[PDB]
Amino acid sequence: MNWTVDIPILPPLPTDLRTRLDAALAKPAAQQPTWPADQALAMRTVLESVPPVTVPSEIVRLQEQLAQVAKGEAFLLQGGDCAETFMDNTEPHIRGNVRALLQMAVVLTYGASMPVVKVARIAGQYAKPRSADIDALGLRSYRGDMINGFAPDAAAREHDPSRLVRAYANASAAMNLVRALTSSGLASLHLVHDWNREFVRTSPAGARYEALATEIDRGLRFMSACGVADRNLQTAEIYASHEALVLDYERAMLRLSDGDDGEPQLFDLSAHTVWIGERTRQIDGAHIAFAQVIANPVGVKLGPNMTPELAVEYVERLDPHNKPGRLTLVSRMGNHKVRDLLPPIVEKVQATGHQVIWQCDPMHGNTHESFKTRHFDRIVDEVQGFFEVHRALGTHPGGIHVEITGENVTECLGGAQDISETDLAGRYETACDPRLNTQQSLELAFLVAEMLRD
Amino acid sequence: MNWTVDIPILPPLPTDLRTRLDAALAKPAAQQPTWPADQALAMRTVLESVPPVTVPSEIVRLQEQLAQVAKGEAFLLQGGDCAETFMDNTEPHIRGNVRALLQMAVVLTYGASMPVVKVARIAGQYAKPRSADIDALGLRSYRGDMINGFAPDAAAREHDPSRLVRAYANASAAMNLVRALTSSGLASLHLVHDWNREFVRTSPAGARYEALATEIDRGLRFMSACGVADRNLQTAEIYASHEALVLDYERAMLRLSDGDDGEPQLFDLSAHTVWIGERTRQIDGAHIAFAQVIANPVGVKLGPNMTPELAVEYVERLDPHNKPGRLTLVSRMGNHKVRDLLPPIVEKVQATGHQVIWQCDPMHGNTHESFKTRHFDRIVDEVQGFFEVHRALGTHPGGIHVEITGENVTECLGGAQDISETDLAGRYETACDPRLNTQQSLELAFLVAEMLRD
Amino acid sequence: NWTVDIPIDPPLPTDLRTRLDAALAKPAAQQPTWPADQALAMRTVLESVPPVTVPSEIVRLQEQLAQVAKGEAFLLQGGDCAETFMDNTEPHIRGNVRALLQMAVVLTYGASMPVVKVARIAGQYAKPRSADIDALGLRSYRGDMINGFAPDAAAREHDPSRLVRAYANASAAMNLVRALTSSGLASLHLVHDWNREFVRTSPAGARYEALATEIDRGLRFMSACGVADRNLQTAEIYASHEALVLDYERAMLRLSDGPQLFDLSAHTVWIGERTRQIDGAHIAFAQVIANPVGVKLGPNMTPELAVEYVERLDPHNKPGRLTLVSRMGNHKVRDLLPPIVEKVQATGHQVIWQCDPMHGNTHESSTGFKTRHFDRIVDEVQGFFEVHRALGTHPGGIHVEITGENVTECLGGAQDISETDLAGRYETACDPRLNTQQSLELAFLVAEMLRD
Amino acid sequence: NWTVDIPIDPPLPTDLRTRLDAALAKPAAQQPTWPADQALAMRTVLESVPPVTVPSEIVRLQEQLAQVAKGEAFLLQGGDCAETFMDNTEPHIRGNVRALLQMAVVLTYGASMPVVKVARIAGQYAKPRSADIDALGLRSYRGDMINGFAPDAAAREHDPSRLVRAYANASAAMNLVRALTSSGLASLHLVHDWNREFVRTSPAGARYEALATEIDRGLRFMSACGVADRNLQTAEIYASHEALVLDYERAMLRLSDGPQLFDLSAHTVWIGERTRQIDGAHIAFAQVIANPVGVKLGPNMTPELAVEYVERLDPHNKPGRLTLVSRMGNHKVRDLLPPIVEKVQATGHQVIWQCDPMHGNTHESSTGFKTRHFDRIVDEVQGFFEVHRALGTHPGGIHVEITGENVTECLGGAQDISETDLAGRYETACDPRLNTQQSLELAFLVAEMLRD
């Protein structure tokens, strides 16, 4: 019960790009799968000839849109599953996650009074880092479906390089549907807002969000009243992102491009934008060096051990040309620490004259065990603290990065539903970290819109 | 000190239109100037060859926009000076009245959540009816600058047919500027709203209107955030209207048109839309019969002696083809009477299956003497009662007709400025009835927007 | 053996499954011979995969095809005769999309009306046969959804896992088509610059200069007039293939959200000359799906059977739902097409009349290669236009086999491809395609038929 | 006497009035001889009337003229030689606007760039003279702003009330121009239908069929491509006249809201051949206003005086602020224009080079009428194009005298107007105009110069 692909038996990379890529990949790389080199090379050779998930002109367009974010003239929303799985890579699940992100985007667009750049964790979020090799059950840790299987048995946890090709197949299939959905009616502003209005009338805390929902509704109707050309309301752009973790995968998805802008560059065409996590951001490591040789916008996760001085080193290495929006610094401090730890980092980075996007990840600093879980109020409070830090400094609170789903899961405590510890057992479906369910993600949008409205 | 025009020494009217026009004009006509027939005919002959103030395709476009109003899908705002004068027919005064109307329109567009058709009392509002021939000073009454002079002496009050040509010259000059202003930046939504925001921060009652002003602001910014094509925000259409009173003038401004829609029709090209007042709406009179033979949208003022049965007769005579928006019925009952008198008229007219625009004139039923004056709260209360009548019947409160100016006059009592009886003497400038000043007109817009929001 | 294996892990409504099951009980010609249990397992995988297309796209195409049927638009359908998995690459997809778009610019200008642009792409992985045993004594190649092109027995086995490989390749191709057409490849100005360069370097460029310059001047006129230009920055390219392998097509059925059955493996599909049996499963399958459909009509067609297709496949008289695709041969089209058109017009229904000038015009070269002469291809389109001109009916579109590659598969054109030139770059896995230059030259020639 | 009399009832800033007063102390040629007290009273009326144009319109025109100066747009200027109060009617205005728009369609297509459309309208009420005493022994007609065309002594008196009559007629005309151009008369599709009908019925229609059909096909291509079409529904027609009567022009000065001085009697004005004295009041007046301005350059022009105009009137090097309007005669343009262009280009400034092919090509017929031959009109434009082609400079526009009336004033064209035909409909109050057919024929001929 296998499908079977052939290992395929152009002009070479420009000499300098080959040199730089090899140098980047020769550096130490944390959190890599352990599979045979010959097998990995077979899979890379397959992936080097597949159609790309994204194309360079979209990445250049995203860079332009992110430059507006960095300049204080747009807001970045990034969200989706903590981990995609091959099993749940289905039309309803994709449709649900795209809907949940669009619903947030409407509320955040209105609240920010500026465009929102909408970036899904989708079409490649198939690899995760682990602090431990051996898990709580004594098994080799699950590292996402690009590496091994979620099932709790030894054979499933074996690192399988064929998962590189399965991950690409699943990613391009998802991406095709995201494109179709967003261009063909799912992203109609009016339809998306109708879902928000239904949330407000059926949610336990709907009375809380009714006033802002109605103001949004009246804002939408005002556009029709004014006779606005409305094609821009019928569709939205949803960009693809994931953590750039498995370097066998990312290097195989590199393509060379440019006869539009000056010189040929390497673009990672597995996504539009990628980020480097806490456990793989070693300053002299392969992940950061790889990010230096690709043209895509990138982000780096910054946790509570971050110094102002290291943050500047990231900026100087990853934004060497001072291109607004090329670099996003993703704060994940914990709600109890963000107000204290973030200001000195922001000050020192702003003093460089570079314009990064400051993005809040309020998930990864606020996890505990009841089930691995997160309380909704701590999530909300970290974004609140993040906004306070920026208001005090006159800097731009540029966006959020959240883990969400359109599914009615029971993974995070709280929200208007008041999800309890005993409730968690009902629909705890994440392959990894607890996600805000569709209602909690929308509620967070409304709360953040009020922080924006200030 | 006279300029001097020549009395000019095509194919004739279609036989049926000539018959119908002659029959209409042979009927009794109230409130007509008393000047020699030979002199009137000389002036009409001059006016029969002048460039028209308006063109038929604009009137057909206005009919279409008014049909939406009648169907409950748009709102009609009509406003301007009670009487234009040749003396104040100046760029600042025109600009100020156009601004005051645009400012109202923004607030009303947002409040109604639907398009507003914007109709100025302008480029022809130069004639008024009088209940008395002899005024309080013993002089022949002033009847507007198309007939005689405002100055309180006998010679000025003589009816002068040369005022027909002066009125046209002044009207076309004003109309030219209204067109220029509205197409070239004065009607930019963003600029107009900036004036409203300034009103809110400097008005004595600005704190009252701050919340709705900010919601409007956020509605405007939302359009930019969504990337709306914005040329429709850079301009607005302001239509010209006046009371069709002086039949020598209106008949001379008739032009024949049509090779677009079936047959040639007579259009009154002195305005886009005209109305018939209380004192000239005799059912078998020349004014109503004249309105039957022109293609323009028309309105009829309905005062407190109106019966349901007469209202239906107006509808059947003036909207014989059941064309939504061809007829506007303009309620002016007084705030103390509107809730009682209007419902039976609305019911009986709705039962016909015709769709008229129901428009509230809250000025002409609410006048008293301290100076002729009106209290702002009675004006507001009549519109309130009008909205209540319609809410109860499920019918469409279709618009308002007000007398306003961009000037900081002191003519109506009250408003956030609390204009007192002693204040009236400061800037009582109207050639006729007391107007809401620029601040009072804007305040009324905000109050009516809340009636719309309900 | 230079392969890698990839492991494989609510139903449609009962009423619609009852319908489908009744339809698919009809005999199906040209089906793969793989085991039913294996086929079922693969269908079960495909029943839950993300679809290649979505229903609102198909509803939109139907609207645009209604306009073609009414004489207010023109249908351009084009791509590889047979897509292969190994050539399903970015350069090849980009080249085929480019080639179709280049034709569409010239045809839009020449027709003076919108062109509905439909690629043979993201699914054209199966073909009937041409014979039980091929010339090498092997089971015939049936396209990559069924078996492998490689001339060995093992490759030629019917492998139902190729259903999943086909879907993976289809969705990956469609993803790229969507990306390219939304991000700059379908910019009218860019596409027309490629056309200008063709006129500049083509051996017959002098012939097409005047019309190229007209188009250029029409394009500049748009800028001159200040039009809002976002609609010049992108184009819609729809996906199509021959609906042949019913295991694949049935597994890709989905219900719309409301609700109808759509085949979401493509936007539109057609039924070929060998599988259009009026009481067969392919026609029955086309009857039950909501997608716009086509039926190939070759020289054995009678007017009466044509009417039977209209009655089966357009029961509700929806203009443009059914396309009748003429493929007669240039020597027969003028004679055979008119009585079919007359009888079908007399039904009251509005079909699209589309010319396939390729499939009735194939012959074998003295040098061995299956080939087609460019002049016969052009002549059938010409005769097709003459038939419709004479009847007052709409010559609604063309259906061609083309590539952006500089292949040597069809004889003639301005390059004067000879029988000896055929050996250079004969790369098709099935029928000979117009190369990029020949396909654009055809577009210019058909543009002059539209202008005439 | 068949007339009716119409009774007549904060200052500009002191600094700007000081400037103006200094400028207007310069001698002014060709001014009316009415009494100063009367002139002052009329100016005082005009100082408070609603303006004919507004500053943001003039700023917008300046932006569009900057593009013409840079070779990225073309200037079309056209209308009556002299407007009269009695012909300032809806049919006549509509016809002249129609005629200009018809030319603009053909020229936009031919230039492959935007056309800035400027009417001689809403102000062209004054002219210099041609002589102290006309051929009837009367004081000369000076245009309707000054006196009456009627050949009697009383009509020929200089009457300053005509300043107010002029303003009333100007504002009424401009009102109508705005209405017509915003409400359907300037619909591209409608205007082009009039052009098609001209090609269909013109004696020389066969000559212009090919280009008319190209335009039609360019228009249909826009619809085919789905462009957002509101910008095809309207056009901007700007107002211009010769700034001659300084009492009128100074009284129509306004300050922008911020602030500059604009002459709000028009969008753009030019200074004629008889009043362009370098140290005169007209040049000084053009120097102080912010409007785009033109200067007529006839055959006595030297390159050096041309440079003096550039330095006086474009002190800030604002491209398109100054237009130099060549009127040499077709027999002299090729010889006289090049050295003027070279010297002016060497200044570094960017003027608009505009061809007036009318005023250097007037002669008298044997039958008495002042006339112009169409072939000489066309030939000067041709030579103008040749001069600029040879220098690598931009042939920036044309300035023509035209009407929508079927008059018989210019000899030739496809209608072959003869000397004997001139007596039929010679209606101009001054110079001979191209009739509606001749003006459109010229547009086709200049479109081919642009295409060549």
Ligand SMILES: N[C@@H](Cc1c[nH]c2ccccc12)C(=O)O
């Ligand atoms: N296209 C605009 C407006 C819009 C359409 N659909 C949306 C859904 C959510 C938010 C905004 C939108 C945008 O993406 O911003």
Ligand SMILES: N[C@@H](Cc1c[nH]c2ccccc12)C(=O)O
């Ligand atoms: N053109 C739109 C929007 C608009 C522009 N300017 C305005 C001023 C007031 C109100 C609305 C507008 C309209 O007239 O409705």
Ligand SMILES: N[C@@H](Cc1c[nH]c2ccccc12)C(=O)O
């Ligand atoms: N979107 C329009 C115009 C267009 C854009 N790109 C194109 C490429 C080819 C043909 C037309 C176009 C259309 O598809 O018709």
Ligand SMILES: N[C@@H](Cc1c[nH]c2ccccc12)C(=O)O
């Ligand atoms: N508004 C555009 C297109 C246009 C509309 N009507 C026209 C009439 C003539 C020429 C062009 C046009 C322009 O002025 O160029």
Ligand SMILES: N[C@@H](Cc1ccccc1)C(=O)O
């Ligand atoms: N998600 C399923 C089906 C699938 C296969 C290939 C591409 C897309 C989806 C799998 O991994 O087998």
Ligand SMILES: N[C@@H](Cc1ccccc1)C(=O)O
């Ligand atoms: N994928 C190649 C690099 C490459 C990118 C783009 C084109 C060619 C080569 C590697 O990993 O070494």
Ligand SMILES: N[C@@H](Cc1ccccc1)C(=O)O
């Ligand atoms: N309002 C002034 C000036 C004026 C004259 C003519 C037209 C417009 C304005 C008047 O009546 O005399």
Ligand SMILES: N[C@@H](Cc1ccccc1)C(=O)O
């Ligand atoms: N003005 C004419 C009627 C008319 C209208 C239009 C054209 C011709 C005549 C009248 O009063 O009698």
Ligand SMILES: N[C@@H](Cc1ccccc1)C(=O)O
């Ligand atoms: N086209 C190649 C690689 C590929 C696999 C899956 C999807 C897309 C491409 C093959 O089928 O072997």
Ligand SMILES: N[C@@H](Cc1ccccc1)C(=O)O
């Ligand atoms: N053109 C006519 C009538 C007219 C007067 C005023 C303004 C417009 C037109 C005249 O001057 O006598």
Ligand SMILES: [Cl-]
């Ligand atoms: Cl059955």
Ligand SMILES: [Cl-]
């Ligand atoms: Cl078979």
Ligand SMILES: [Cl-]
């Ligand atoms: Cl001085």
Ligand SMILES: [Cl-]
């Ligand atoms: Cl002199």
Ligand SMILES: [Mn+2]
């Ligand atoms: Mn996570």
Ligand SMILES: [Mn+2]
């Ligand atoms: Mn009044």
